[PDB]
Amino acid sequence: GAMGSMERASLIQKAKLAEQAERYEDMAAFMKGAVEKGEELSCEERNLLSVAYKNVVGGQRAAWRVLSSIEQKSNKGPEVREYREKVETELQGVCDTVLGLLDSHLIKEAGDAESRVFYLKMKGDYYRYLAEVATGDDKKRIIDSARSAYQEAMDISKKEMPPTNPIRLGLALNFSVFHYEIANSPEEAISLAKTTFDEAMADLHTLSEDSYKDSTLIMQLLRDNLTLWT
């Protein structure tokens, strides 16, 4: 709504300025405005959208975990629960906003593997964040929504992208985290990380120096998780 009067190019320009200023709420609002212009996003623009919202929700999640820990230790008056609930509702609202952008209409217009995988990974991630705070009748459905998004992304990535593609790698990293932290499936998490790492290692020989650097950065995160989990 509020960004409706600003040029798409100006919104993208201001998102980049907001990133430099570490103003991630502004960054996200600018990128939401850009998405709502109705055009497909380029690779760079997709990454600006992702950075903005991941920083916003990352702060919310960190706050939620602090407050949830205090609340758990408490089990005084209603204030800890109320404030945890306030942060939770704000986080849920941001996740619903991102999911709404993906559904209206980024995913449906995304035909190339790179864009479709990127958006489905995001869909998995934001349902995952919803799952982290879920306790009601729809919690299993939230978890399944994350799983379904990640699984569609995985199926396309395996068919259409090399094993070293950074999006394919990051998707596998995050789906492995889903398995370990949300689905109570540590063995699946470990298997996925290990297979991803090994298949990427075997394809590094095909890469330029710059691509190598990108792929190996994410492989190291896989390895770091495998080290933590084993």
């Binding site: 991941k54 990352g58 995050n174 985290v177 995160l221 998780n225 933590l228 989990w229």
Partner: peptide, 7 residues
């Protein structure tokens, strides 16, 4: 556990 970081 760590997921993919932001830059």
């Amino acid at each position: 556990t760590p997921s993919l970081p932001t830059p």
